[PDB]
């Protein structure tokens, strides 16, 4: 009964209501609005919760799901790259997971700058990209890894591990098995980098706002939310956190579209079921 169609329909009912409530009004006080006259949102209907916004000029949010702290963001616009790199650096980012495919990035119509596979200078910030390992995730899906070294006068230099799912399927959802493998890789990568900072006595370890994995696809609501849900289920601190909790939490903390497609919710439900984790709150 817990994972039957009745429970799934009830979960969908609750989540649909929340999406509606969270729909942005014109000039919505709950959502970040552009400053300085620069385009902020990649998609007009996919907005950034103001109270959890990371930077005034990015579509990006702090998200905590149970105990699991991350940042979810859109793929940065060309105009946003310097700010995006400063966010990555200031966060001492232990892993940047990019879930937009190489095909998506290559479509110049989509305006997704190839910012992590290439070196470049963006205003005051110089970025060096290096290729590292490649890890298979299942079903031929491959995680290509990089390190981004971010340099800027007046700032400490920071290197950021990157996990890029370069052949993320463009038209279909990835399986629970691939999602699990991806969550494990992203978590493991973040743990290794966080450990390095701890070993150096970084003050960032004691700051709630820092050392957060940063995750984006194109809009940072579909594949991004699926991954974040799987990561929170990997976190041993999150016993008894329901699927209803995780999705409502992502939604209130970023926008109502988090877990955009039923196909993505299907995967979270399957993962939850595998763990005997509740779908619904009693």
UniProtKB/Swiss-Prot annotation:
Enzyme Commission identifier(s): 3.1.3.48
Ranges of residues in domain Tyrosine-protein phosphatase: 1-275
GO molecular function, one term: protein tyrosine phosphatase activity
Record-level GO cellular component terms: extracellular region
Reaction(s) the record says it catalyses: O-phospho-L-tyrosyl-[protein] + H2O = L-tyrosyl-[protein] + phosphate
Source species: Yersinia enterocolitica
Keywords recorded for this protein, A-Z: Hydrolase, Plasmid, Protein phosphatase, Secreted, Virulence
Keyword Hydrolase: yes
Enzyme class: hydrolase
Cited function: Essential virulence determinant. This protein is a protein tyrosine phosphatase. The essential function of YopH in Yersinia pathogenesis is host-protein dephosphorylation. It contributes to the ability of the bacteria to resist phagocytosis by peritoneal macrophages.
Subcellular location per the Swiss-Prot or TrEMBL entry: Secreted
Inducing or repressing factors: At 37 degrees Celsius in the absence of calcium.
Top-level lineage group: Bacteria
Active site positions: 217 (phosphocysteine intermediate)
UniProt name for this protein: Tyrosine-protein phosphatase YopH
Gene: yopH
Subunit details: Monomer.
Keyword Thylakoid: no
Family: Belongs to the protein-tyrosine phosphatase family. Non-receptor class subfamily.
């Amino acid at each position: 009964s817990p994972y039957g169609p009745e429970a799934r329909a009830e979960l969908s009912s609750r989540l649909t209501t929340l999406r509606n409530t969270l729909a942005p009004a014109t000039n919505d006080p709950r959502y970040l609005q552009a400053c300085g006259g620069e385009k902020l949102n990649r998609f007009r209907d996919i907005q950034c919760r103001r109270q959890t916004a990371v930077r005034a000029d990015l579509n990006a949010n702090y998200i905590q799901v149970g105990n699991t702290r991350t940042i979810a963001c859109q793929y940065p616009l060309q105009s946003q790259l310097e700010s995006h790199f400063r966010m990555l650096a200031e966060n001492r980012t232990p892993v940047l997971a990019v879930l937009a495919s190489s095909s998506e990035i290559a479509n110049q119509r989509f305006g997704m700058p190839d910012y992590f596979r290439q070196s470049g200078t963006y205003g005051s910030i110089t970025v060096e990209s290096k290729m590292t390992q490649q890890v298979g995730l299942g079903d031929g899906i491959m995680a290509d890894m990089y390190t981004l070294t971010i340099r800027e006068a007046g700032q400490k230099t920071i290197s950021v591990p990157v996990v890029h799912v370069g052949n993320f399927p463009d038209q279909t959802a990835v399986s629970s098995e691939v999602t699990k493998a991806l969550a494990s890789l992203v978590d493991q990568t973040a743990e290794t980098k966080r450990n390095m900072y701890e070993s150096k006595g970084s003050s960032a370890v004691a700051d709630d706002s820092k050392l957060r994995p940063v995750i984006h696809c194109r809009a940072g609501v579909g594949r991004t939310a699926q991954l974040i849900g799987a990561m929170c289920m990997n976190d041993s601190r999150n016993s008894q956190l329901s699927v209803e909790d995780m999705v409502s939490q992502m939604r209130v903390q970023r926008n109502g579209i988090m877990v955009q497609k039923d196909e993505q919710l299907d995967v979270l439900i399957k993962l939850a079921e595998g763990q005997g984790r509740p779908l619904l709150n009693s």
